[PDB]
A and B are shown apart, each in its own frame.
Chain A
Amino acid sequence: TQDTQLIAVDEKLDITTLTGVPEEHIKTRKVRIFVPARNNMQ
């Protein structure tokens, strides 16, 4: 239906080479993922 060489590639998407992050901010930069808890004042 969308024939533009629709070919299966299953390796995990890794654009790490082109985003621009340096060699140390890619690994040492541990990142947290939470929902901001409601500010108890408000």
Chain B
Amino acid sequence: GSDRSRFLEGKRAVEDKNIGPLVKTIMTRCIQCTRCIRFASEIAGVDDLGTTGRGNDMQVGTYIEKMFMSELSGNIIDICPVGALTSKPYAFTARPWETRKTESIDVMDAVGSNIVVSTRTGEVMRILPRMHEDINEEWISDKTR
């Protein structure tokens, strides 16, 4: 990365959406990496995500208001590289550099999905999916998230 900006013009802003009381969508912070639309269409098996517009705008969302009903919808938080998609329950409760991550498994499902439990000062903040490939890869159910 550089150390200073050459941008002297106005910026661009996008209307925020709401696709479920479990993920927060700040679409202005999106980088149009289209990681969301692919994860939904190929892995989640749903098509509630898409990229509308022509030009710089290129809004990514649902056009018509909808909600992410996927049982694996929680992983799209992990997929988004920016703060465009974030966990609603965790929203502004902790910051990453203070969480003492620990490893455990899912129990809601018999799969025993490997999870990373992020705790801080003696309480559990977030359930993050671990990497195990052949059993759970890097994704966990919405219930255990």
Contacts and interface: CB of A to CB of B under 8 A. Distances in A.
Interface in A1-42: 34, 36-41
B103 interface: yes
Interface string B65-78: 00000000000001
Nearest to B102: A32
Interface residues of B, number: 11
Interface stretch (B7-15, B36-44, B123-131): B123-131
Contacts of A36: 101
B121 to A, nearest CB: 20
Interface string B99-113: 001010000000000
Interface of B: 78, 96, 101, 103, 114, 116, 128-131, 138
Contacts of B116: 37, 39-40
Contacts of A39: 96, 101, 116, 128
Interface of A: 34, 36-41
Given A41-B78, A41-B96, 14 more contacts: A34-B103, A36-B101, A37-B103, A37-B114, A37-B116, A38-B131, A39-B101, A39-B116, A40-B78, A40-B116, A40-B128, A40-B129, A40-B131, A40-B138
Nearest to B116: A37
A32 to B, nearest CB: 8
